[PDB]
Design a protein around this ligand. Structure first.
Ligand code: AGS
Ligand code: AGS
Ligand code: MG
Ligand code: MG
Lengths: 191, 370, 370, 191
């Protein structure tokens, strides 16, 4: 049950849920496995905040174990498109398509908590049918794989070959190791 | 030149007699020269002196002293007000433009709105400006003009009053000091009717009083300060990272000041928060003031750089400007010496030495009776 | 010194006449020595004396009489207010800095916001502070100043007033008593407009009347008592661990008071609740006050220490402060005495004893008329 | 169903759910298995309280049987990040990542009821697949174990060796025994 928090304004007092109150402060929450429905809310939230104040930065807390690759791209495409710089904070956990969004944040406004952990690996999928259909479906996984590494290399700044070999298998990176890798600029000990 | 210059500046008389007054005085000035009428003919640029003298405004062909004063006034303000360089530049450019001869035909030299966080040099930069320029500072605390009846006293006097001291407080002051700095502190508190007065000032440059006297605002600097949206500046966001609420504060300024008012303002300056490096400069400023007070009592004070840095770390608060630093100076420097000055070794002579104790992170005071 | 001191303190006259005033008067004083022109030569010290009389401000070179009073000021106040040593230090030290010459250039001696629970000496410390220094107490009840029209009186007169009296209650009072204690009790109740009026009173130390007279707050101690967040400290938190609630009052202070107001304040001292140990001292104060009332009638009171402890336990309530202690003393001591004083056994002077009996746990009164 | 309560105010009467009313008094309930979703609610509540009063001490009633270790770290990071001292109380049981949050409270504010029971054990997790992947995931749990021991040592004050040997197997600690270990400063029976 989400609690209701009272917000006091000169006009009067308005009761909002805890999540809505934080949304008013440009704080979006990316929780749970990535999906189209939950991503639509994140996308819808970014557009509303961008209009209210396109200059102000938007913060996107990220505590996710990963999820659908395509759903996350909607969020990623909306972050680069809008003018507000979308800051990203990795609270608790970040995984495939959760960490990609973390590094996708604007330069100098990406952070990780001191005890946070982040993981990265290649997209996982499968298909069953005739060999001809499996070839095209399999080829698409490579296309997104190569495209994903190009984006991560762009944000992290590392060589494409380094990400390709690292992404191949699962790699658990602690918060300090992420800074060396380039996923985040520093740790959020305090502002 | 006399007729053109006189109507432009002399606004208290009609054109025929006004022109003759400049021609008669010009001849009087030439005959009174110590030399035996060397400048027998009345040439151009001499009449400019007479009109400037009659109108009590700066003349053309600025003297080397004024040129040095305006050139030197790029750092002299920066030696008392640190940071906020963009605000100082706006003030000096308006002054430099007007004295150069390039200025608004009927508007003032400059109209500025100084908004920002608490404890920044919004007012101090204005006060020190008048001192650097050697001109009278006209102050008007707008917290006393919050009611409609009080605002009527600025433009003129209420009809009911039978007192012989008629005339407005702003019109009389401007006439007394045409070349001056007009400070409207906390303008947001004032009644909106005040805006109707300033709107015609920044647009026309003259405010006729109830008596009918004409006040010229061409040479008067207009600087008004405010704390609109200041609450947003000190407000902390509900998040891990505190966000910059400067953009939101500007919206409040746009709710109090109509677009026409802001459109007529030459600039709308926002004062940035004081940085750590700046605080060290602010500490030295307060330390100097302390030494001056002590000099009247024959007491000398020397503070180590380490102690100065320690005072900054304790008193540094970005949200609360530089006023907290003053409290730190009072608690750690003035208080230990006040007890010693009244009843103690520091009756005279001084030779004080302040230094930090790293082991206990506390300053050690040394008093010499001399 | 004459031109420097006069322009600084004497702000109602222009410099040529103003400076000559302290010169001409210093000459008359020099020739009026006790026997015959003791000190023919005039010195800077004599000028300071004349300036302190013209401006009615404390003179420099504080005599030993004042020093003794200042050093013992904290101890004297401690004998009246118990448990608020932090507040006394701020008031006493600020006063010492001003007299010693380390006060603010143009700000007041001290601006303080005494916020605390009920019955903690927020107003008693300020009332007794004036008696210790022998200066007039300017007590302003801010509950009355709850409407915008009322605030106008503080700096002016109501609109449409035809009488000669165009003065304000705050400007005139300060002018009559420049060295005084200004008390604004329960200022939070007052309309927010009053806060805007005091901004110039702290930052600049001057307030301008509607007529234009400029008051001087450089020597007036400014104290403001507020009960902000009183309901919060009264209520107990919904939790296993009760909360302090002292911080909650400070968050309400931020809401009621604008940031510029709080930044001007020298310090915000939060008065703490009275401990059981200090309540014993309060009982002695009330009994001593009762003895003074009884001495006029000619009767002397004697109360055993065991009785005093019982009264403290009966009236000890942290949330309700020290006011209940008066009620238990009034009910237990004043009520029986009144019945006798009015009707027998106490008309004439007679020693009376009050002692507790452990068996009945009730006070015993022996009138012993004489 | 959750009951509703009336809060008396000068402006008027406000209706709040029982949980939201307690939130107004800086009381947060950590009940149930730790998860990414419930942790965000606790995290959002902590951030909201910080804005209302960043100096007053927050309270957290921990009555959970443990859960996802990574989600709990989101709450642990926030507890030390925010300036308020997050007091912790133990109602009923406390288990892995429940006790870790109970001992993470500020010194002098951690408490336990007389009958509250605390349980501490090492993280339990499993992964199946290729041998290379098992080694990577296995190393992570070992690294996380050390972080748990290191963090608990700071709060409890005991050496890593004592915690390492004791945490190898499940250890139940009553309220008096827990105080000796250092999880909590004292009991709430009399204050
Ligand atoms: N930038 C600065 N450099 C040096 N001293 C400063 C600066 N800003 C403030 N001060 C000091 O702080 C005081 C001046 O504060 P002001 O500039 O008058 O504040 P303000 O801008 O009017 O703020 P309000 O009251 O919120 S409108 C003096 O004691 C100055 O010495
Ligand atoms: N700290 C104290 N020390 C000694 N006597 C005290 C103290 N506080 C209160 N008293 C006694 O109680 C009387 C009344 O205290 P008040 O002046 O009403 O306190 P206050 O805190 O100013 O009250 P309000 O209601 O909060 S404005 C004083 O005159 C003393 O007799
Ligand atoms: Mg100002
Ligand atoms: Mg009182």
């Amino acid at each position: 049950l989400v609690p209701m928090v009272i917000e006091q304004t000169s006009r009067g007092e308005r009761s909002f849920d805890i999540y809505s109150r934080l949304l008013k402060e440009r704080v979006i929450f990316l929780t749970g496995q990535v999906e189209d429905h939950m991503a639509n809310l994140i996308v819808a939230q970014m557009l509303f905040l961008e209009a209210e104040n396109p200059e102000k930065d938007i913060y996107l807390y990220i505590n996710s174990p990963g999820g659908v690759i395509t759903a996350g791209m909607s969020i990623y495409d909306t972050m680069q498109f809008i003018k507000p710089d979308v800051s990203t904070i990795c609270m608790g956990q970040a995984a495939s398509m959760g960490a990609f969004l973390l590094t996708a944040g604007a330069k100098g406004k990406r952070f990780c908590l001191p005890n946070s952990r982040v993981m990265i690996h290649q997209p996982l999928g499968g298909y069953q049918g005739q060999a001809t259909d499996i070839e095209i479906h399999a080829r698409e996984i490579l296309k997104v794989k190569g495209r994903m590494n190009e984006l991560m290399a762009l944000h992290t700044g590392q060589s494409l070959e380094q990400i390709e070999r690292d992404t191949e298998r699962d790699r658990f990176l602690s918060a300090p190791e992420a800074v060396e890798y380039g996923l985040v600029d520093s740790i959020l000990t305090h502002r | 030149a006399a007729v053109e210059l006189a109507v432009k500046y002399i606004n208290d008389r009609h054109l025929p007699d006004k022109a003759i007054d400049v021609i008669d005085e010009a001849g009087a000035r030439a005959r009174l020269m110590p030399v035996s009428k060397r400048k027998k003919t009345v040439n151009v640029a001499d009449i400019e002196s007479v009109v400037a003298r009659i109108a009590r405004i700066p003349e053309k062909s600025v003297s080397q002293s004024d040129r040095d004063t305006l050139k030197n006034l790029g750092d002299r303000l920066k030696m008392l007000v640190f940071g906020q360089d963009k605000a100082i530049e706006a003030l000096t450019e308006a002054i430099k433009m007007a004295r150069a001869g390039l200025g608004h035909e009927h508007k003032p030299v400059g109209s500025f709105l100084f908004a920002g966080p608490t404890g920044v040099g919004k007012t101090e930069v204005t006060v020190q400006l008048s001192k650097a320029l050697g001109i009278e500072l006209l102050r008007f605390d707008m917290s006393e003009y919050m009611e409609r009846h009080t605002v009527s006293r600025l433009i003129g006097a209420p009809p009911g009053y039978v007192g012989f001291d008629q005339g407005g407080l702003l019109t009389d002051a401007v006439i007394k000091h045409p070349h001056a700095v007009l400070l409207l502190d906390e303008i947001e508190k004032a009644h909106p009717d005040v805006f109707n007065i300033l709107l015609q000032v920044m647009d026309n440059g003259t405010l006729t009083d109830n008596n009918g006297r004409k006040a010229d605002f061409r040479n008067v600097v207009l600087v008004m300060t405010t704390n609109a949206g200041v609450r947003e500046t000190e407000r902390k966001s509900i998040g891990l990272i505190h966000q910059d609420n400067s953009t939101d504060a500007m919206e409040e300024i746009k709710k109090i000041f109509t677009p026409e008012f802001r459109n007529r303002l030459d600039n709308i300056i926002w004062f940035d928060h004081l940085s750590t490096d700046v605080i060290h400069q602010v500490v030295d400023k307060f330390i100097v003031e302390l030494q001056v007070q002590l000099d009247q009592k024959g007491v000398s004070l020397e503070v180590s750089q380490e102690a100065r840095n320690w005072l900054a770390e304790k008193g540094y608060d970005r949200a609360m400007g530089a006023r907290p630093m003053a409290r730190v100076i009072q608690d750690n420097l003035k208080k230990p010496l006040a007890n010693e000055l009244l009843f103690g070794s520091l009756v005279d002579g001084g030779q004080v030495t302040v230094a930090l104790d790293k082991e206990k992170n506390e300053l050690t005071y040394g008093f010499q009776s001399a």
